[PDB]
Amino acid sequence: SKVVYVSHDGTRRELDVADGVSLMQAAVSNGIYDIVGDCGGSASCATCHVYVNEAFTDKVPAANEREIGMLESVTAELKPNSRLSCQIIMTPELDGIVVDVPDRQW
Numbered sequence: 001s002k003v004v005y006v007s008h009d010g011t012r013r014e015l016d017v018a019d020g021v022s023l024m025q026a027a028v029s030n031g032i033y034d035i036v037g038d039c040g041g042s043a044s045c046a047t048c049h050v051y052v053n054e055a056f057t058d059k060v061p062a063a064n065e066r067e068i069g070m071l072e073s074v075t076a077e078l079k080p081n082s083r084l085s086c087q088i089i090m091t092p093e094l095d096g097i098v099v100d101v102p103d104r105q106w
């Protein structure tokens with residue numbers, strides 16, 4: 001399924017993500033180093049921080065307690081639509097989802 005990563009400079013990268021793969025895994029697997037997951041994807045850091053486009057704010061599973069807690073560690077501005085990419089799991093229903101990658105992760 002399609003996922004679009006928009007950089008701080010507006011650069012857009014479209015990736016084909018398989019079912020069950022997190023947006024973090026797909027990002028690092030394709031050279032999108034802006035959101036490398038330091039903790040490895042277990043919601044133990046905040047370097048995979050991204051802004052989920054309002055167009056898909058609800059069409060995505062709500063953040064859990066671990067994520068909620070860790071979002072406070074993000075270095076980039078914490079916004080209402082701030083999420084941890086390693087917590088967003090791809091499914092056909094998310095096809096076309098767009099997430100903005102904060103330039104800073106530290």
Ligand code: FES
Pocket residue numbers: 024036037038039040041042043044045046047048070084085086087
């Ligand atoms: S990679 Fe560590 S919280 Fe997402």
